């Protein structure tokens, strides 16, 4: 099992999925088209601001 | 590019913390397993395994 | 001065080079729901109007 952690903007959360395109799925973090796993995103405005 | 954040920004411009879990559902010796107990082994008898 | 629903405002777009990625910072939305076309594949198409 591999756990990968980072922080992004809200409207970019939809880019963490197979077969996506953007400024995050192109130059920052890319997922294979045959991904098998899970993602977990949650708001952190209290801490990271 | 810097990625500055403020509490005044509306939803979709606020930080989101992301963690992704990737598994390997293939045929190899297993290492990470769920918490289920192991019973005994019976042979030469029709069973469910 | 966004208009009322019963008298909604319509604007027509004409000869131009549209870029459907600079509008993610003009509005604090989360994602663009669509129906005919995937939002990712919008920078590679030509529309009449």
From Swiss-Prot, chain C:
It comes from the Viruses. Changing residue 1 to K: In strain: Mu/B.1.621. Binds to host ACE2. RBD also interacts with the N-linked glycan on 'Asn-90' of ACE2. Cleavage of S generates a polybasic C-terminal sequence on S1 that binds to host Neuropilin-1 (NRP1) and Neuropilin-2 (NRP2) receptors. Interacts with host integrin alpha-5/beta-1 (ITGA5:ITGB1) and with ACE2 in complex with integrin alpha-5/beta-1 (ITGA5:ITGB1). May interact via cytoplasmic c-terminus with M protein. May interact (via N-terminus) with host bilirubin and biliverdin, thereby preventing antibody binding to the SARS-CoV-2 spike NTD via an allosteric mechanism. Attaches the virion to the cell membrane by interacting with host receptor, initiating the infection. The major receptor is host ACE2. When S2/S2' has been cleaved, binding to the receptor triggers direct fusion at the cell membrane. When S2/S2' has not been cleaved, binding to the receptor results in internalization of the virus by endocytosis using host TFRC and GRM2 and leading to fusion of the virion membrane with the host endosomal membrane. Alternatively, may use NRP1/NRP2 and integrin as entry receptors. This is Spike protein S1. It comes from Severe acute respiratory syndrome coronavirus 2. The lineage of its organism: Viruses, Riboviria, Orthornavirae, Pisuviricota, Pisoniviricetes. The chain holds residues 346 to 394 of 1273 of the full protein.
């Amino acid at each position: 099992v591999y756990a990968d952690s980072f922080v992004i903007r809200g409207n970019e959360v939809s880019q963490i999925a197979p077969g996506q395109t953007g400024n995050i799925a192109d130059y920052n973090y890319k997922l294979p088209d045959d991904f098998t796993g899970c993602v977990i995103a949650w708001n952190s405005n209290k801490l990271d601001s | 590019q810097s990625y500055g954040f403020r509490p005044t920004y509306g939803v979709g411009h606020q930080p989101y913390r992301v963690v992704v879990l990737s598994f390997e559902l293939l045929h190899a010796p297993a290492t990470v397993c769920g918490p289920k107990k192991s019973t005994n082994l019976v042979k030469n008898k029709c069973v469910n395994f | 001065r966004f208009a009322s629903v019963y008298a909604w405002n319509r604007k027509r777009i004409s000869n131009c080079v549209a870029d459907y990625s600079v509008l993610y910072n003009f509005a604090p939305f989360f994602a663009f729901k669509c129906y005919g076309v995937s939002p990712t594949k919008l920078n590679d198409l030509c529309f009449t109007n």
